Homo-oligomer: A and B are copies of this chain.
Amino acid sequence: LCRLCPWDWTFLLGNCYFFSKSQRNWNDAVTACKEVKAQLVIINSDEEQTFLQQTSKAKGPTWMGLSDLKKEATWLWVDGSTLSSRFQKYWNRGEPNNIGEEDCVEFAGDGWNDSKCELKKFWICKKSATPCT
């Protein structure tokens, strides 16, 4: 009897992803993921991005674990690592804008946006998968 992931999480390339059904601000999103020992989703491959972008686009605007709250225009994942320049292409045209008013990143349609952290949105969690011999 093999489960790679918790119930109602989706397996993808060695990790498990949870899609919220409700909506929260960016900080509470972090918390909610922390409560299940997970991280507001960090993106580390193109395939992951594509996979999340498409779900996310069918649900509505959705938070990822990317912010410039420490230092403006320096976008940091919730684990402290910097936005690799090879994901720069996933920002929508027109984005990011309102630097120092819009500090949290969301999926929106086909790409990424920056948004007011206080706004309520869907969120996604990531944590590692477990094997099956």
Interface residues of A (CB under 8 A from B): 1-4, 7-8, 10-14, 19, 21-23, 47, 50-51, 54-55, 58-60, 122, 129, 131-132
Contacts and interface: CB of A to CB of B under 8 A. Distances in A.
Given A10-B10, A11-B55, A58-B132, 15 more contacts: A1-B21, A1-B23, A2-B59, A3-B21, A4-B55, A4-B58, A7-B8, A11-B58, A12-B54, A12-B55, A14-B58, A58-B129, A58-B131, A59-B132, A60-B132
A131 B12 CA distance: 23
Copies in the complex: 2
Q: Is the interface of A mostly helix, strand, loop or mixed?
A: loop
Nearest to A13: B54
Contacts of A21: 1-3
7 contacts: A2-B60, A3-B21, A7-B8, A8-B8, A58-B131, A58-B132, A60-B132
